[PDB]
């Protein structure tokens, strides 16, 4: 069976953990310690293909984790998450993409730009802004809400589709 190794990155508070838990466990977590980094696995069917997802929910801590290092080394695609009501988190995206490029020594890493918390009306990062930054990176942009579970499977599945392209 096919496995896809995914890594979720972005500034604190954007909803990395909430997005991963909605994907895995199908509920919206009210709070999840911002410092906790763990990996999650699930068997899913994407486009009729039964597969295993293996996901790292990063937390940007300093202590050595071999696991973290192994996911950055062998991880096949990356979700780069900002929140649509947090301009600073959008300004921070580029730093994360650049880290990822350096780990892979490649400009061509499967990636999706995720604009989360789209349930919220106070949107300071507009669709066009995000769509334009993604077009500059040559990656997809997907709007999500871990709260309403809007776009959640689309974001992760899209990243799998980007991995399938790279593999060919």
Ligand X SMILES: Nc1nc2c(ncn2[C@@H]2O[C@H](COP(=O)(O)OP(=O)(O)O)[C@@H](O)[C@H]2O)c(=O)[nH]1
Taking CB under 5 A as the rule, does residue 17 contact Mg ion? Answer: yes
Nearer to Mg ion, 16 or 97 (CB): 16
Phi-psi region of 136 (alpha: psi -120 to 50; beta: other; left: phi over 0): alpha
Residue that is written with structure tokens 């790292």 in the block: 56
Judged by CB under 6 A, the stretch of 27-35, 37-45, 72-80, 96-104 that binds ligand X is 27-35
Q: Which of 130, 135, 145, 57 is nearest to 90 (CA)?
A: 130
Q: Are 55 and 112 in contact (CB under 8 A)?
A: no
Residue that is written with structure tokens 């106070």 in the block: 122
Taking CB under 6 A as the rule, does residue 86 contact ligand X? Answer: no
Taking CB under 6 A as the rule, does residue 77 contact ligand X? Answer: no
Distance (Å, whole) CA 128 – CA 135: 10
Nearer to ligand X, 14 or 111 (CB): 14
Taking CB under 6 A as the rule, does residue 31 contact ligand X? Answer: yes
Q: Binder to ligand X among 71, 80, 110, 116 (CB under 6 A)?
A: 116
Taking CB under 6 A as the rule, does residue 38 contact ligand X? Answer: no
* 3-state secondary structure at position 79: strand
Structure tokens at 99: 């880290």
Orientation of helix 93-104 relative to helix 66-74, angle to 10°: 80
Taking CB under 6 A as the rule, does residue 40 contact ligand X? Answer: no
Q: Binder to ligand X among 74, 120, 126, 135 (CB under 6 A)?
A: 120
CB of 164 to ligand X, least distance (A): 26
Write out the residues near ligand X by the rule CB under 6 A.
Answer: 10, 12-18, 30-32, 34, 116-117, 119-120, 145-147
């Amino acid at each position: 069976m096919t496995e896809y190794k995914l890594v979720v990155v972005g500034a604190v508070g954007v909803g990395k953990s909430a997005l991963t838990i909605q994907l895995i466990q199908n509920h919206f977590v009210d709070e999840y310690d911002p410092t906790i980094e763990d990996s999650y696995r699930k068997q899913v069917v994407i486009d009729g293909e039964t597969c295993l997802l293996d996901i790292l929910d990063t937390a940007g801590q300093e202590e050595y984790s071999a696991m973290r290092d192994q996911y950055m080394r062998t991880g096949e695609g990356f979700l780069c998450v900002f929140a649509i009501n947090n301009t600073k988190s959008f300004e921070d995206i580029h730093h994360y993409r650049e880290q990822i490029k350096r780990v892979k020594d490649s400009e061509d890493v499967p990636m999706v730009l995720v604009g989360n918390k789209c349930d919220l009306p106070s949107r300071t990062v507009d669709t066009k802004q995000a769509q334009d930054l993604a077009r500059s990176y040559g990656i997809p942009f997907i709007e999500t809400s871990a709260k309403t579970r809007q776009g959640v499977d689309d974001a992760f599945y899209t990243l799998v589709r980007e991995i399938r392209k790279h593999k060919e």
